């Protein structure tokens, strides 16, 4: 492989280097092998990245994996969207899958949760417990048929007497 190592004179030049590609995931023991660089070892599997590294390293690896996924079709996606997605997926201390066993098992409102997966199970759970739905989400307001506090609904409009008597 070729790396853009800066030249001693100041410019950037391509310095070829040897790169080892492996078909297995055992980075816990590979990093301890002498003669390699432990500060540059990378694994395409982000699940075990945080087993030896931190949660932030796992989030960075997940973002890199997503960027590599959207790389061949030629489409360009702004960094903010993918960064927000990976931050949501790593808000807690571990990976939060986008499925019924991941972001679903949260502390959000039951009404907003139960609109995607199976419903009656979570409704029965809510009935058995006594949790309170704050109704500050979008799904709850859609169900109740009220203006959700999003976009134009993020604020309140009031009338003032002082300005009313000011003009006339």
């Amino acid at each position: 492989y070729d790396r853009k190592v800066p030249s001693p004179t100041g410019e950037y030049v391509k310095e070829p280097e040897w790169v080892l590609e492996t078909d297995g995931v055992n980075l816990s023991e590979v990093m301890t092998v002498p003669g390699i660089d432990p500060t540059r070892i990378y694994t395409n599997s982000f699940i075990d990245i945080m087993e030896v590294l931190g949660i932030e390293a796992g989030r960075a690896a997940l973002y890199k994996e997503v960027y590599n996924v959207i790389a061949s079709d030629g489409s360009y996606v702004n960094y903010r969207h993918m960064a927000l997605l990976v931050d949501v997926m790593t808000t807690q201390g571990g990976l939060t899958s986008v499925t019924r066993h991941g972001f679903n098992r949260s502390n959000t409102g039951a009404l907003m949760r139960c609109s995607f997966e199976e419903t009656v199970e979570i409704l029965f759970e809510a009935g058995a417990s006594a949790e309170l739905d704050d109704c500050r989400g979008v799904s709850e307001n859609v169900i109740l048929g009220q203006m959700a506090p999003i976009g134009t609904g993020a604020f309140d409009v009031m009338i003032d007497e002082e300005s009313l008597v000011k003009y006339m």
Partner: protein, 172 residues
Amino acid sequence: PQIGDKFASRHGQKGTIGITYRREDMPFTAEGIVPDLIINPHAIPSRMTVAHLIECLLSKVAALSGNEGDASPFTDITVEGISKLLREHGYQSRGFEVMYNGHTGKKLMAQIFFGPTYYQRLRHMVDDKIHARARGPMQVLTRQPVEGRSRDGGLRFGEMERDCMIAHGAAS
């Protein structure tokens, strides 16, 4: 037939009528021949429909000569033979023709491909698809608008439209 009716050829080139023109407004050749249909050339390179042009040339040759043209696959018929026959008839080697604008009668550059082509009318007509509802019949259980053009139904505002409107920020 009217605007919106679906029409297609024998090569998977489907489409609908967008506009209609009279004989005077249509382009004409030096012999006074006007086309029944006009097709955009942009549909050819993407779909790789060479057989459309080959069949057009073969149909032109057959109409000029009066003998049925053989379009069976895996035969010895080549484009060169059709071109030679067309040149012998004295029209063009490749089927291009010189037409005129018609609106002004001026000569048109970029000579146009011409020739008969088989076309078929599909079962999809705009008359059977246009729908509009404004406070029509009412359901019983859900008390929501009924479904179906025949019973004056209403279009469904699905979930995808809901998140689209949410992303737009239009809460009201």
